Amino acid sequence: RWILGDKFDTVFPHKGSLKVLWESRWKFACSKSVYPFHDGSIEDFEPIFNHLISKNINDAASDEYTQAFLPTASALEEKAAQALQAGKHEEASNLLCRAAVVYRISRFPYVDITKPNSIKRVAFERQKQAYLKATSLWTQPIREVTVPHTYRTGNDGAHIPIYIRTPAGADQSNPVPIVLIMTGLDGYRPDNSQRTHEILARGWAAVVAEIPGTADCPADPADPASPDRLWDSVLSYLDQRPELNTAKMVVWGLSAGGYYAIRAAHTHRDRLLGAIAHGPGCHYYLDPEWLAKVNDHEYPFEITAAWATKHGYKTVEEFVAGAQKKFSLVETGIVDQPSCRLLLLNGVDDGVVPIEDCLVLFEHGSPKEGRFYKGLPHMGYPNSLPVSYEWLEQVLAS
């Protein structure tokens, strides 16, 4: 029934097995310092996973998982403090970034927005402190701004914390183009260092914002219109920043963020030059037949429980029963209007969100742009990264 084909029915070997996840995929991702271990070091993680494997800890959602990481993170923070005392700012920055990645993996896959005392929430708070300390030592530092949510209605929160990083020389005399990153289910505002490096290297500002039902996003997760109000507040803030050119602005949605990049490409088409949706869902990812097997594929742990919470559902049963008709950009008719240029990037063999969620968008509204990677799973990494920048260069060309 799916382009994924027979692999749809494959039970992936790492399912319910942190040992297999580590030994077959994550050890190598960590070794290579690529997602989700970007900015990280194997020396920090090998001892932690050896501990988790020896204790037969498999449930990432358990406190036994999260607490295994915390002493290592603390040790790196103290090493950074010692480095900083000796005036070794580069070493201190690198150590704090390493602590941030340890916190990041400790809170994989999802900070429960309904559990403010959860150890994963504690880990995320410590990650943000360590990350801001690390990036304060950068020549072009990442600054946090709490954007007042002027467009808030109903159950929306009051505050939108975003990261902003501006290139050397960014001035009101010649305002710079903006790339706004919309983060995902397991990646939040501190998880995008290399993207900010690449954006700044091309003379652009990087802005990072979390999506509804995640991290510190104030958007009502249960209101499908809540992201529209969120981007109204964020874009209106960026409009008033003298050194940022909102006339040359592209949105970049990562994984769960892809949905929001697609949506904003339609809802905010007159305020964006372009959108990139990286491994996006928009319709078929919420199909009950797809949700029936989504936990058996390449995502490191069970995803449906996290998805239920992120979509504002009190139970997984309600999510599976109701989500598609409520949130599908196809079912709700969001796709039946024009959009700014929209680049769709994914692996054809995505088992997290179906490649059909890219393909369906060519049958609605404006022409879409796409590159889909044969035989590759969710996000199509590493192949899908370089083309992102080639496209951004074309769209933001002077």
Residue numbers in the entry: 3 to 400
Sentences from the paper on this structure:
A common step during their assembly is polyketide trimming, which Afyg1p, Wdyg1p, and PlAntI catalyze. In summary, the N‐ and C‐domains in all three enzymes are oriented in a back‐to‐back fashion forming an interface that encloses the intramolecular binding cavity next to the active site. The catalytic triad is formed exclusively by the α/β‐hydrolase domain with the nucleophilic serine located in the consensus GXSXG esterase motif. The resulting Ser‐His‐Asp network is perfectly aligned with distances in the range of 2.5–2.8 Å between the active‐site residues.
For example, in Aspergillus fumigatus (Af), the type I PKS AfPksP produces the naphthopyrone heptaketide YWA1, whose acetoacetyl side chain is removed by the serine hydrolase Afyg1p. Both enzymes consist of an N‐domain and a C‐domain connected with a short linker. The N‐domains exhibit an α‐helix bundle, whereas the C‐domains adopt a classical α/β‐hydrolase topology. The amino acid sequences of Afyg1p and Wdyg1p have 40% sequence identity, which explains the similarity in their overall folds and active‐site residues (rmsd = 1.1 Å over 382 Cα‐atoms, Figure 3b). Although both enzymes differ significantly from PlAntI in terms of catalysis and primary sequence, their superposition shows a perfect match of secondary structure elements (rmsd = 1.6 Å over 244 Cα‐atoms for Afyg1p and rmsd = 1.8 Å over 247 Cα‐atoms for Wdyg1p). Consistent with the more extended polar substrate, the acetoacetyl binding site in Afyg1p is less hydrophobic, and the chamber formed by Ala258, Tyr287, Ile305, Trp309, and Val355 is increased in size (800 Å3). Thereby, Trp309 is located adjacent to the oxyanion hole and coordinates a well‐defined water molecule that is also present in Afyg1papo, Afyg1pPMSF, and Afyg1p:1,3‐DHN, as well as in Afyg1p:THN. Thus, the indole group of Trp309 likely stabilizes the distal carbonyl oxygen atom in the acetoacetyl sidechain. Taken together, the specificity pocket of Afyg1p is entirely occupied by the product, whereas in Afyg1papo, each position matching the hydroxyl groups 1─OH, 6─OH, and 8─OH of THN and 1─OH of 1,3‐DHN (analogous to 3─OH in THN) is filled by a water molecule.
